[PDB]
Amino acid sequence: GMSVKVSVDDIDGITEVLNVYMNAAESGTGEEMSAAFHKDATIFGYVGDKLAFNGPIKDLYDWHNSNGPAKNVQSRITNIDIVGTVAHARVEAENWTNFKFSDLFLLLKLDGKWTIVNKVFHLHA
Amino acid sequence: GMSVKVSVDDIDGITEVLNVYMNAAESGTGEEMSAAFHKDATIFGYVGDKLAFNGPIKDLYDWHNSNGPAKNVQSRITNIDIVGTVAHARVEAENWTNFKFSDLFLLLKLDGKWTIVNKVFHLHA
Amino acid sequence: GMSVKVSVDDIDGITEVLNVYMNAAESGTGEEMSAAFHKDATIFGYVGDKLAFNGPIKDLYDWHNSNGPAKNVQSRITNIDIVGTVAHARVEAENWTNFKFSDLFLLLKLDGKWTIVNKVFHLHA
Amino acid sequence: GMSVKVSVDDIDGITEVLNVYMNAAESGTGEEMSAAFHKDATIFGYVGDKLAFNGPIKDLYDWHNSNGPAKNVQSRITNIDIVGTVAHARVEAENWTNFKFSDLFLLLKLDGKWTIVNKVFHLHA
Ligand SMILES: [Cl-]
Instruction: Provide the CATH number for the domain around residue D29.
Output: 3.10.450.50
Q: Which has the closest alpha carbon to B113: B7, B9, B6, B5?
A: B9
> For residues A86 and A108, what is the distance between their CA atoms, to the nearest angstrom?
5
Residue A119 with chain B: CB contacts under 8 Å: 106
- Cα(A61) to ligand 1 centroid in Å equals 9
**What is the residue type of D102?**
S
Backbone region of residue D37 per phi and psi (left: phi > 0; alpha: psi in -120 to 50; beta: other values): beta
Query: In 10 A of CB B88, how many CB atoms?
Result: 24
Q: Using H for helix, E for strand and C for coil, what is the string for chain C?
A: CCCCCCCHHHHHHHHHHHHHHHHHHHCCCHHHHHHHEEEEEEEEEEECCEEEEEEECHHHHHHHHHCCCCCCCEEEEEEEEEECCEEEEEEEEEEECCEEEEEEEEEEEECCEEEEEEEEEEECC
CA of A89, closest CA in chain B: separation in Å?
9
Q: Residue A121, exposed/middle/buried by CB under 10 A (0-12, 13-18, 19+)? A: buried
**Cβ neighbours of C110 in D, within 8 Å:** 51
Closest approach of chain A CAs to the CA of D94, in angstroms?
A: 7
Instruction: Name the residue facing B106 among A81, A106, A124 (closest C-beta).
Output: A106
CA atoms within a 13 Å half-sphere pointing along the CA-CB vector of A46: 19
What is the DSSP secondary structure assignment for residue D24, as one 8-state letter?
A: H
Interface probe, candidates B10, B18, B76, chain C, greatest C C-beta count within 10 A? B76
Instruction: Check B6 against C94: CB less than 8 A apart.
Output: no
The closest of C90, C87, C67 to C78, measured between CA atoms, is C90
Out of A88, A120, A125, closest to residue B117 by CB: A120
The total domain count for chain C is: 1
Rg of chain C over Cα atoms, rounded to whole angstroms, equals 14
CA of A60 to the centre of ligand 1 (A): 7
Query: How open is the CA angle B61-B47-B38, to the nearest 5 degrees?
Result: 30
Q: Which residues of B touch C (CB under 8 A)?
A: 5-8, 11-12, 74-76, 78-82, 92, 94, 102, 124
Say how many Å lie between the first and final Cα of chain A, rounded.
Answer: 46
- Cα–Cα distance, B2 to C80 (Å, whole number): 26
Range of the domain at D30: 1-125
- Measure the CA–CA gap between B87 and B81, rounded to whole angstroms: 6
Count of alpha carbons within 13 angstroms of residue D30, beta-carbon side: 12
Residues of D in contact with C106 (CB under 8 A): 44, 104, 106, 118-120
* CA C67 from centroid of its chain's CA atoms: 17
Please, which experimental method was used?
X-ray
Subunits with 3+ Cβ pairs within 8 Å of B are: A, C
Say how far apart CA A91 and CA A24 lie, in whole Å: 14
Q: Do B125 and A2 touch (CB under 8 A)?
A: yes
How many other C-beta atoms lie within 10 A of the C-beta of residue B37?
23
Q: What is the 3-state secondary structure (H, E, C) of chain A?
A: CCCCCCCHHHHHHHHHHHHHHHHHHHHCCHHHHHHHEEEEEEEEEEECCEEEEEEECHHHHHHHHHHCCCCCCEEEEEEEEEECCEEEEEEEEEEECCEEEEEEEEEEEECCEEEEEEEEEEECC
CB contacts of B79 in chain C (<8 Å) are: 78-81
Which among A66, A56, A69, A53 is positioned nearest to A21, based on CA atoms? A69
Whether the CB-CB separation of B86 and B106 falls below 8 Å is answered with yes
What is the rounded CA–CA span in Å between residue D53 and residue D79?
Answer: 23
Q: C53 to each of B18, B22, D23, how far by Cα in Å?
A: 36, 40, 29
Please tell me the distance from the alpha carbon of residue D121 to that of residue D91, in angstroms, as a whole number.
10
Q: Report the distance separating Cα C18 and Cα C40, nearest Å.
A: 17
